[PDB]
Amino acid sequence: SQPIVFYDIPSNDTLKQSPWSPNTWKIRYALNIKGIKYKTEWVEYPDIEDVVKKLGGKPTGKKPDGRDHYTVPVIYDPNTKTVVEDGIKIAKYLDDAYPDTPRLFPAGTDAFQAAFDDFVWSVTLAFPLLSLLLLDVSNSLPPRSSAYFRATREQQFGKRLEEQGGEERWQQLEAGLGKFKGYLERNGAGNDLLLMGTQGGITYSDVQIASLFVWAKVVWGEGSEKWKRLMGFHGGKWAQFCAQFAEYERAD
Amino acid sequence: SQPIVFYDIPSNDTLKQSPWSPNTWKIRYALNIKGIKYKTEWVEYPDIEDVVKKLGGKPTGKKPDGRDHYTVPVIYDPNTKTVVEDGIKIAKYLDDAYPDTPRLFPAGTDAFQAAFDDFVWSVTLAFPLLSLLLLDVSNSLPPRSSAYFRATREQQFGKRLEEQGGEERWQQLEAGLGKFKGYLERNGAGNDLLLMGTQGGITYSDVQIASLFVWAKVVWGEGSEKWKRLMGFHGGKWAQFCAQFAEYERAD
């Protein structure tokens, strides 16, 4: 059985070309947790539209110009001759097409995890963290990608990148992560480190959060002041949380 | 074994004193689905804080004045001499203390359902519908409660009640309800009428939506233009959704 081709966006020498994207990382984690064979195909931001089209992939949405929006993660599975785009579809595909690998969407959790998906990618939690990372990401891309990144994101938010971030958002972040700590604590003590209990296994929804963190960790650097601050939060719960995902970090 | 005392806010003769609140209804449903014996204690909006204090209950949050905020639903269980406040705590309590009754929080769904809670009570879905009901609710209350309701809610949003609502919100409502339809549809055909599939049973999270709808139905009236419009949405999916809850409507 052949390796799955996995399209990821690369980084420059300041990150040792470690993968960084919180969106592709949720599928890298999927692959690693599931132990399915894959090889990374690196693609630059400006080249994603053409690469995914030439590949026969579908766009994951529309831009405000009504123009097709093509994104990564994306996968080509030789073993089934299919091309899956859109991270939460790709993860379920890895469930359906490889049923003897750990299930990221346990039975009946399918709609709950979809709801949780809107919680993550929202002004509550991912966007604050984005703002803290928008600039450092620009400086962590190869030149062509970095240029595309700065242009498009600056347009997207009306600000320069250097205007983004600051303490207003470090609070919003702590607040969102707090809300999440809240939800987890409803699982009761001893179960407050995975959405379905530190008993009933890792889910895609867990992986989504793990991915926000690994993204921060890679771009700021395990030693940075920013990373250590974030691990500061909530008595270091997120340190304990991220540890569960340590064995699943295989940059390739 | 003795009836649970269940505090709900009453309505005037225009609703035949049917209970109406979408917050108390989710616990009414819980009790009816679980077939646990209860009797309703009616309490007026302005008398809630004192009733719950004289009862030994805790407030469920803070007002912006930092002043304690006491709310219903609330229950007193004679059989265990305890007083639970806060809807989602009350529902879990009815799980824990009555384990041979249908479980509203199936194992490991605890945090997922807590995340869903924030989905429901948000500008996405519950608030748009609130704006469509704020006025008719005020006209549906006993005079003392109606007065308190109009006062406090007008202060809360900075508009008169009569300024609230309109098409802008009927769209937001259709949109949020669409987003729900989307989540459900991830369960696959034949499973898209309950969060855990029309197979794996009714959850508290399901009940929360059913309660928004019964609220609308009671206040507007099963015959109203508004109610029929709402049932119009998404090809009448919500009609099908609501039917699952019909046998659990016991005003008392």
Numbering used by the authors:
A (entry chain A), B (entry chain B): 2 to 253
Task: Give sentences copied directly from the paper behind this entry.
Glutathione transferases (GSTs; EC 2.5.1.18) constitute a large superfamily of multifunctional enzymes that are involved in phase II of xenobiotic detoxification by catalyzing the conjugation of glutathione (GSH) to a variety of electrophilic compounds. The fungal specific class GSTFuA is particularly concerned by this expansion. As assumed in our recent report PcGSTFuA2, PcGSTFuA3 and PcGSTFuA1 share the same structure, which contains distinctive features when compared with canonical GST structure: (i) a new mode of dimerization, (ii) an original β-hairpin (β2’β2’’) that inhibits the formation of the regular GST dimer and acts as a lid over the G-site and (iii) a supplementary helix (α4’), between helices α4 and α5, that closes the presumed H-site.
PcGSTFuA2 crystallized in the space group C2221 with three dimers in the asymmetric unit. Structural superpositions of apo/holo PcGSTFuA1, PcGSTFuA2 and PcGSTFuA3 unambiguously showed that PcGSTFuA2 and PcGSTFuA3 are in the holo conformation in the conditions used. The observed holo conformations can be explained by the presence of crystallization agent molecules in the G sites, which mimic some of the interactions formed by bound GSH. The citrate ion stabilization involves the main chains of Tyr-71 and Val-73 and the side-chains of Tyr-46, His-70 and Arg-154. The distance plot, which compares superposed structures of holo PcGSTFuA1 and PcGSTFuA2, reveals no big differences. The largest is localized in the center of the helix α4 where a residue is inserted in PcGSTFuA2 sequence. This difference results in a disruption in the continuity of helix α4.
